[PDB]
Design a protein around this ligand. Sequence first.
Ligand SMILES: Nc1nc2c(-c3c(Cl)cc4c(N5C[C@H]6CC[C@@H](C5)N6)nc(OC[C@@]56CCCN5C[C@H](F)C6)nc4c3F)ccc(F)c2s1
Ligand SMILES: Nc1nc2c(ncn2[C@@H]2O[C@H](COP(=O)(O)OP(=O)(O)O)[C@@H](O)[C@H]2O)c(=O)[nH]1
Ligand SMILES: [Mg+2]
Length: 170
Amino acid sequence: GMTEYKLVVVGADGVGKSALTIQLIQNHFVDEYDPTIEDSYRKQVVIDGETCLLDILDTAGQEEYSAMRDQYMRTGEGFLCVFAINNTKSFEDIHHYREQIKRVKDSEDVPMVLVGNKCDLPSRTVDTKQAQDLARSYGIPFIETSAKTRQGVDDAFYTLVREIRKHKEK
Ligand SMILES: Nc1nc2c(-c3c(Cl)cc4c(N5C[C@H]6CC[C@@H](C5)N6)nc(OC[C@@]56CCCN5C[C@H](F)C6)nc4c3F)ccc(F)c2s1
Ligand SMILES: Nc1nc2c(ncn2[C@@H]2O[C@H](COP(=O)(O)OP(=O)(O)O)[C@@H](O)[C@H]2O)c(=O)[nH]1
Ligand SMILES: [Mg+2]
């Protein structure tokens, strides 16, 4: 039987969470996917010889901290924390997203990858060095992506799968 991985994509509105998820599932860039739709998407992919069923939650909508929302987010096994390289605020919000994940998982060691999206744009405001220094302080990988060109998309999701797999085999 295939191994199921529950991945959750988090980050500020408009950073490219939906475009990244759709690039992984469908291999095409979808410009302007409904900013309000939160949904889960499935992809069967073989990673390092293992047949994986990736169940990916693309977050959207209201910020809320109910017992239900916490319980739901806690089911995630690994998290992509996404910011956009042309939106400093989205990068500044990363500490918040990481803290919410650590809080509901009750752990300092949650599989996580920091993703700096929209690297195809020339309007960079978040330096690569500042972002990689933050990932280094967290002990997690940092991958720059472009959902528009597909650059780094497989690397970001498959690195997260490998982090979850490593966590389960400890
Ligand atoms: N209950 C649990 N939730 C979570 C979350 C979670 C989710 Cl799912 C949504 C939002 C969210 N939304 C989802 C998408 C993107 C933006 C918008 C609202 N639409 N927004 C904010 O923060 C937004 C800001 C601005 C206003 C005040 N906040 C604090 C900072 F200033 C940043 N955090 C969110 C968040 F952390 C993540 C991981 C977990 F494990 C848990 S557990
Ligand atoms: N140039 C560029 N635009 C992108 C990229 N990813 C997403 N976008 C655009 O940025 C906007 C927000 O993307 P979206 O996927 O809806 O982000 P979400 O709100 O995090 O789900 C849309 O206009 C997307 O088409 C990317 O890598 N490069
Ligand atoms: Mg979206």
